[PDB]
Amino acid sequence: SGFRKMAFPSGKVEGCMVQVTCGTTTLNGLWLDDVVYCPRHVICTSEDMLNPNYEDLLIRKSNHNFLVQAGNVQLRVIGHSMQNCVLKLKVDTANPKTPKYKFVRIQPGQTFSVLACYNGSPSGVYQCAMRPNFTIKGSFLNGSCGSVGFNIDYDCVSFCYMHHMELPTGVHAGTDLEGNFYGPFVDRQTAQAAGTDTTITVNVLAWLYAAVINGDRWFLNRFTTTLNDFNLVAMKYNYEPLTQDHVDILGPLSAQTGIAVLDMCASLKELLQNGMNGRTILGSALLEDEFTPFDVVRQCSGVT
Amino acid sequence: SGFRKMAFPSGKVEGCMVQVTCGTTTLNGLWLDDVVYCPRHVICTSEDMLNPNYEDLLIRKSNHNFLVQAGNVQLRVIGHSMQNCVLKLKVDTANPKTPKYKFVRIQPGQTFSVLACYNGSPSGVYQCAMRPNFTIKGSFLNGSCGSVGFNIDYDCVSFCYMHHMELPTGVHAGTDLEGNFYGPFVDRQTAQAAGTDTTITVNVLAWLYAAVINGDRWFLNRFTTTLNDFNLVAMKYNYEPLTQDHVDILGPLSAQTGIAVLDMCASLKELLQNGMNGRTILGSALLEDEFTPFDVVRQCSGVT
Ligand SMILES: COc1ccccc1OCCN(C)C(=O)c1cc(=O)[nH]c2ccccc12
Numbered sequence: 210s211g212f213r214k215m216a217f218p219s220g221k222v223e224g225c226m227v228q229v230t231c232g233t234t235t236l237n238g239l240w241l242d243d244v245v246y247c248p249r250h251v252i253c254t255s256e257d258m259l260n261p262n263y264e265d266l267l268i269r270k271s272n273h274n275f276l277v278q279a280g281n282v283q284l285r286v287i288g289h290s291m292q293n294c295v296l297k298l299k300v301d302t303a304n305p306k307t308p309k310y311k312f313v314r315i316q317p318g319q320t321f322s323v324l325a326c327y328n329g330s331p332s333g334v335y336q337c338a339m340r341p342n343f344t345i346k347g348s349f350l351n352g353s354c355g356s357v358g359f360n361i362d363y364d365c366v367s368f369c370y371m372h373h374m375e376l377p378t379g380v381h382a383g384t385d386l387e388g389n390f391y392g393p394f395v396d397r398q399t400a401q402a403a404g405t406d407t408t409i410t411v412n413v414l415a416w417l418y419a420a421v422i423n424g425d426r427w428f429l430n431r432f433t434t435t436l437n438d439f440n441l442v443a444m445k446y447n448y449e450p451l452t453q454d455h456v457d458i459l460g461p462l463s464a465q466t467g468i469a470v471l472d473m474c475a476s477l478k479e480l481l482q483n484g485m486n487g488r489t490i491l492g493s494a495l496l497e498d499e500f501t502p503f504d505v506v507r508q509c510s511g512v513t
Numbered sequence: 514s515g516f517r518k519m520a521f522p523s524g525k526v527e528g529c530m531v532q533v534t535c536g537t538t539t540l541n542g543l544w545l546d547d548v549v550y551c552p553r554h555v556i557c558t559s560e561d562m563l564n565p566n567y568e569d570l571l572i573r574k575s576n577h578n579f580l581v582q583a584g585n586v587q588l589r590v591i592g593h594s595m596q597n598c599v600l601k602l603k604v605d606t607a608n609p610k611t612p613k614y615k616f617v618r619i620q621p622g623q624t625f626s627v628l629a630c631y632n633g634s635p636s637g638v639y640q641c642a643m644r645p646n647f648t649i650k651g652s653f654l655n656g657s658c659g660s661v662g663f664n665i666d667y668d669c670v671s672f673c674y675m676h677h678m679e680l681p682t683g684v685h686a687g688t689d690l691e692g693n694f695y696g697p698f699v700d701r702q703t704a705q706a707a708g709t710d711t712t713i714t715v716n717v718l719a720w721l722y723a724a725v726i727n728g729d730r731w732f733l734n735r736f737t738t739t740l741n742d743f744n745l746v747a748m749k750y751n752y753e754p755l756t757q758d759h760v761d762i763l764g765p766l767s768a769q770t771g772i773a774v775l776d777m778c779a780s781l782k783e784l785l786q787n788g789m790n791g792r793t794i795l796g797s798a799l800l801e802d803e804f805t806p807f808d809v810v811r812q813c814s815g816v817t
């Protein structure tokens with residue numbers, strides 16, 4: 210028992226991290242097979258970032274301007290191209306540590322692990338949710354761009370995120386591995402509105418199920434509700450409206466605990482309306498939304 | 514910016530995990546050089562665990578009874594010995610993935626990363642504190658024994674914990690890598706009192722400094738206190754008494770923010786006496802004690 214904000218083991222991703230330098234700018238790259246992927250803003254200077262013309266900036270660069278180093282060794286760059294907001298540097302050597310991998314575009318509300326890196330060296334790993342407004346609340350400092358987000362299904366790494374920037378509000382934005390930003394964000398130093406965010410209802414319910422499984426049961430009540438009634442409360446408290454698709458995804462946890470999904474919704478309704486009254490659930494004094502129903506089952510079953 | 518409960522990258526430790534089976538029991542082992550370390554209770558049956566005589570149980574075992582498998586491949590066991598609560602299985606092959614490593618006995622209040630494993634396969638990584646009462650609040654299921662806790666200083670892995678058991682209260686106990694339990698615990702299925710736990714004061718103060726660095730400042734006040742006055746409040750709220758050694762360890766964070774340690778103690782005193790009033794600090798609605806002052810500086814500087 211016990212329930213922690215657990216990240217995937219980062220080893221398979223650590224073996225793919227490299228440092229990419231272009232001019233005076235250094236960030237991280239992801240080396241998979243004979244390609245290194247990195248944010249295109251590695252080609253910018255401080256002058257450029259207020260409104261960069263990436264096409265023009267990239268035209269001044271040749272393969273030999275992209276310095277790619279895999280720890281101690283230098284990679285030879287034999288091609289470069291820009292795809293959306295990422296650069297793809299073709300190298301003459303396939304990464305011998307390339308795991309089985311896929312590039313996926315995750316949905317808002319899904320979770321993933323981030324391997325924070327600086328100068329191509331991994332520094333730490335943590336678990337994130339992609340917020341409903343397509344930002345992530347990460348931990349990133351100067352030099353962290355190019356750090357990636359991923360999930361692991363046995364031996365296959367699904368890369369879903371590459372870090373690009375910190376908004377003036379202190380939240381983070383980035384792209385899928387094809388360089389498409391999540392959300393409305395652009396890679397320029399401008400004020401950028403992140404939409405109104407909401408709490409990921411299906412994840413809060415999954416975490417209440419994790420709490421019951423792990424013995425924290427004080428919040429269970431004698432009530433039930435309907436999707437309609439619960440959604441009036443979700444609207445008032447800025448929670449995502451719950452749908453039958455969310456109820457269906459919670460099916461396995463409902464079966465495991467014997468607590469019908471709408472009865473758990475009634476517990477969540479009372480917690481939203483009354484608060485925790487100074488109590489905690491799984492070591493938290495707030496309603497946690499960074500665990501999906503798949504995360505809760507994986508953690509509560511023992512998936513390797 | 515941003516502040517997350519970050520674990521060390523687990524790659525160096527993933528390369529050391531193996532599965533150890535003795536009879537019908539399977540758990541994890543740690544393969545470093547030509548030795549595999551694992552909990553000695555791998556030699557027990559359900560019958561045995563209420564009061565095992567480990568010396569007698571081990572006498573019935575030969576090298577060939579210890580099945581050690583490193584993923585796909587089988588290791589040949591050429592020696593076995595028990596050291597405190599760990600078994601050391603000498604194998605005929607040194608682990609080619611052995612990182613630079615040390616065995617350390619951590620102090621209560623220090624933090625470390627745990628790589629949770631099942632059947633020798635890593636499943637997830639999370640950051641822990643060793644509680645002042647020598648338990649950890651982990652996430653461990655059947656088959657997780659032998660999972661290890663560690664810290665990483667550049668290329669050196671300091672192993673500090675091997676998981677052995679879950680107390681009836683749902684908290685976790687284990688040993689250093691010489692097999693000495695942290696705390697008063699024994700490896701038998703008996704009710705075992707974990708002492709009165711306390712909140713790690715120096716870590717809460719370090720995390721308040723992390724909050725100020727990352728922009729969460731609402732809790733700063735116009736007050737100051739003394740070590741004596743603050744310790745009366747710490748006593749009332751079951752916090753560890755703060756010492757000058759703790760003040761000295763907070764020196765770098767005090768210098769970085771310009772907030773004197775005793776002024777931060779006055780903010781913590783007001784939070785203890787008044788609560789958070791429904792506000793949050795770094796995404797938490799409670800006072801977090803799982804970040805040491807070294808963790809806060811590492812996370813806020815960019816250490817790889
Ligand atoms: C305004 O910046 C950008 C805007 C759009 C596109 C790229 C921009 O640059 C990114 C800035 N870089 C390079 C960082 O490594 C960075 C990333 C981060 O998440 N946090 C930071 C905090 C402090 C200093 C730097 C960072």
Ligand SMILES: COc1ccccc1OCCN(C)C(=O)c1cc(=O)[nH]c2ccccc12
Nearest residue numbers: 210653654655656657658678679700701702
């Ligand atoms: C009462 O158990 C012990 C007592 C003293 C020494 C060893 C004992 O066994 C450990 C039990 N094992 C083997 C586990 O893998 C385990 C570890 C864990 O932290 N949580 C669990 C939750 C559910 C089922 C099992 C576990």
